[PDB]
Point group: none
Chain length 422, copies 3
């Protein structure tokens, strides 16, 4: 079994990289040290947090630490919404007692105000500089895209990294794509906690975030390798007067209001997406009713379509029909809807129970902002810092989603590998 | 009977006469447009109220929309969960119907749905057909013609898109027609919100298509066309929708700030009216009438206007309140106190011909608080016309109100013959 | 001879502010004097004089009845989720902050968008805030805002003088807010009455929050160096006011949910470091409350019951007065058997009154941020100062409490 698992996984890793090479603008310019490093660093962390006992003790400890934060986050939620989030909801409404708009969306606000404190203190600047510095010293990427890849971990496509603000205007084609892919390879800390309250495995989300930094650079440099010259740090003297908050109280409140609009936007989009798909299911169910079928849903159609891809990652074909739908929904719609239907299988009451090695894969394969919807979020926000580069960002929109998705898929193979071995 | 049939001609002549008396100029009112708009508005009336075929294709349309509305609830059930379940009625009884979670979330869904239909090109297709149909009958400019067809299933002062490149330089009559057509017609998004409240759906559908010729009926009757129509879009035209997924998300967030705004307007007005009645009820204590409320005042005040449009004087005392509350305060408060009479256990019960007239009259976003709604949303494009829009603000509210009253007269005429509603 | 225990206690609190001050040389002697006069004045009028307890008490009821019309709309918006069944299904849980308090902000923003339009509020700043301008050097409003805060909550007080907050001076800003954080709405006061706290006690601090709110505000700065799209229709004004009020709530609540959790997080820090050693259960509610125990004596219960009366005040400052009064009423019960004098229960009744905790800062920041966007920075810097100045006022009332129940 293990000799076949490491073979089924290595083959899975081979296919994913092969796709990037085929879609590469210049396969000859592919710096091996940078792409072999990005692939090695990514798979190295998998052996760190999912295999070796020393790291799993740390990953578990890290989960317990962050779980406290969330437990502290609810102390403000219990104050606000009162008993609408109590255990009395599961006695009265039972399963319906779990209000998604009150258990998940408010957590988006708190974490946004939490990191805003960490950014003001300088905690993030400490972690970004280290992780960012480590990448360029092991790969060969510029200072900008390296710091961006480290900043993309804690913050997805939501907030601008700002650590590359004086760089973005004049980055190379490959450098610009690395930033875009990084934001689509990872998720924000705010939406990360949102998945946790839904039922998504916390230790898996922690590993998935840090895997998105080298994985986000892997398929970024594969699709578009570096050809031009990286901008010098002494010649890029063009820093405009940046406005900053006053104290930690101002920062803590600024992050809350900023995360408030996010929570409202998420809940509004989800109210539409869940409803719109249900409407299409009525149309497909109607059209499918003429010949065949006519129970046919968009859930099932995306299943057979992404079934081959799901099998490549490590999910058995028998269960690829389910994993295919979830990965599909993530890319063509969003990761929130995909996660909403993934937690349905995690329930012990659920009829269809999957294997632990499969649930691990899907958890990593879904963790990512790589969808058709996050394109405009990038282009819309990235154009502010670079108004004369908006044409380049818009073109690499779909290309970055692929690089962002493949990053999640690559991290998912690593999951199915080491969790299949241990 | 014959008396009732005759009475409809009275109400029609009155509403037209008022517009002529308040017209900017009687001279060379274009007869072929005024009589043309009135002919179409009463043609569509008999086409969906008198002929079986119209009512057989309207009922099917009612089920079509209601299913889409039902589809929207699937997203609502996902968002709020058991707070909108049936257990609410087994617990909170009649209070189980949470207006903030039953009606307001529907506004979001339709705003996103139309944003999708506007992204596909379906909406622009129907506008060109209807607008093109108008410009042949009344021969008004292509700019305001499409702006009239757009104002039908579009609200929240998203006029622009047909008019956006034409607003910069148009006559005072074209600008007024847009304002009239905007207030005469309800928002295509909030129309579904009324359905969840208990408002008769088929009446809302008909009133929407009557508010387009009726919106132009009192538009070219108040201030006629006297300058030449310059129809050629300016070069200034420079883009948010990237994908259909983004278009859906962008529309949902757009609709989200609408529900909050509308929801706040209801918590405001209803509370203030009660406070006003707290004063008037106290002031009336000296005069020997502590039961005198703001509702009863507007009822006896607009009672003649109700009697003119086709409502029996016996029930006009109630209809006067609802029609008045729409114009004076807003259409939402009026409908909230209208569905109370639709209850089968109500002590008093209005006639079938009364329910129709009220529903058509109340079906309009033409209120005194909707002036700045137009002004603020129309000035952003052309700030040079801001003083022009606000000048004809109240005059447009009259045109918007007269249009809904006209559709109410046509209602009572063809709903006086059969056409009963549950 | 009780007077010296209070004459010492009123000087010590006034000392605290003279220590924590910006410009001592700027301090207007007349205004700081005039306020403490009214504070000690209004008290004896509702504590001793049984006539003022009825007047000022019915004023709070009548004005709260004006606002009570706001609830006619909350019940239309959320139906039964704010009915009585909530206390029958969730009980204590059932009352909900986000549906019973935050929506009331929309009413105020809509009501005082009409009043300014109809000049009714333009007059009350002229009369009431101009009467107390020739009484003392004010903003011609700021006193008016303090007066308003008496009958309204902390989330419904800055909305009163919001068109003035734009070009408001550094003083009047801290004046309005620190006097705004000290205020408690009246409905909360009624719940406290139901719990055990004497309505005659509560009514005193209700009117002591305005002069006390000015007493310590003007102690930091006066208005240093001598200085101090519109609605089309009234329907439009109400509407425009309503919607602006909504985003106030969204931003206020977003900050509250954040900070209450952040405070809660802070403890989970303090706890681990404490969990490392013997001490740590060591909630910040007590760490400050232990710093308050010395101060507790300076007012009140000389020994052998102060240390417990101080960690009650520490709770008010960190979390809220609801929890502070939740345990205080456990002392008022007959069976408590750690008996406190009628005057020792008078002190903790006033000290714990007011609702100017740490988490309350977030409300200030949010509400301004909608009302005066370029001012949120000038409020976060003077936020923790506002808890200090406010809570010093609540104590100033408790020294007048014991001094006039003895
Ligand atoms: C992102 C969130 C990160 C949270 C903190 C990470 C956990 C860590 C550092 C390890 C980080 C790798 C993360 C991997 C990223 C992929 C503890 O890891 C171990 O610590 C030792 C010595 O410090 C180091 O060597 C290495 O880092 C490693 O060997 C620092 O945080 C610790 O986490 C503890 C949570 O378990 C916290 O301790 C507190 O709670 C414990 C129970 O949960 C109690 O037993 C303990 O007494 C109490 O103090 C505390 O924050 C701290 O000790």
């Amino acid at each position: 079994v293990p000799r076949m698992v490491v073979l089924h996984s290595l083959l899975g890793m081979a296919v994913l990289i092969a796709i990037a090479v085929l879609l590469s603008t210049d396969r000859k310019a592919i710096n091996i040290r940078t792409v072999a490093g990005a692939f090695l660093i990514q798979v190295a962390l998998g052996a760190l947090v999912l295999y070796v006992p020393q790291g799993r003790d740390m990953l578990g400890e890290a989960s317990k630490t962050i779980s406290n934060v969330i437990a502290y986050g609810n102390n403000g939620v219990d104050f606000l919404f009162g008993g609408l989030v109590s255990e009395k909801m599961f006695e009265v409404f039972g399963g319906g007692g779990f209000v998604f708009a009150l258990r998940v969306l408010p957590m988006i606000v708190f974490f946004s105000s939490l990191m805003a404190v960490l950014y003001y203190i300088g905690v993030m600047q400490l972690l970004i500089k280290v992780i960012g510095g480590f990448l360029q010293k092991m790969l060969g990427t510029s200072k900008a895209e390296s710091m961006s890849a480290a900043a993309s971990i804690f913050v997805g496509q939501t907030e601008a990294p700002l650590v590359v603000r004086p760089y973005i205007r004049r980055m190379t084609e490959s450098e610009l794509f690395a930033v875009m892919s990084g934001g689509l390879a990872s998720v924000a800390g705010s939406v990360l906690a949102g998945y946790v309250q839904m039922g998504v495995p916390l230790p898996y989300l922690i590993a998935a975030s840090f895997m998105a930094a080298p994985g986000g650079l892997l398929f970024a440099k594969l699709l578009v390798p570096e050809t031009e010259r990286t901008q010098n740090d002494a010649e890029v003297l063009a820093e405009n007067e940046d406005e900053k908050p006053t104290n930690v109280i101002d920062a803590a409140a600024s992050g809350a209001v900023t995360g408030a609009q996010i929570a409202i936007a998420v809940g509004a989009s989800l109210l539409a997406f869940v409803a719109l798909i249900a409407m299409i299911n009525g149309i497909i169910g109607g059209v499918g009713g003429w010949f065949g079928h006519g129970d046919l849903t968009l859930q099932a159609i995306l299943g057979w379509l992404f079934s081959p891809l799901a099998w490549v990652i490590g999910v058995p074909w028998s269960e690829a029909g389910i994993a295919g739908s979830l990965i599909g929904q993530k890319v063509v719609i969003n990761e929130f809807v995909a996660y909403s239907e993934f937690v349905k299988y995690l329930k012990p009451e659920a009829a269809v129970q999957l294997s632990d090695t499969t649930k691990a894969i899907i958890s990593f394969a879904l963790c990512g902002a790589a969808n058709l919807g996050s394109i405009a979020v990038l282009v819309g926000g990235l154009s502010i810092m670079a108004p004369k580069r908006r044409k380049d960002v818009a073109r690499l929109g779909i290309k970055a989603v692929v690089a962002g998705s493949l990053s999640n898929l690559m991290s998912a193979v690593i999951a199915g590998l080491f969790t299949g071995l241990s």
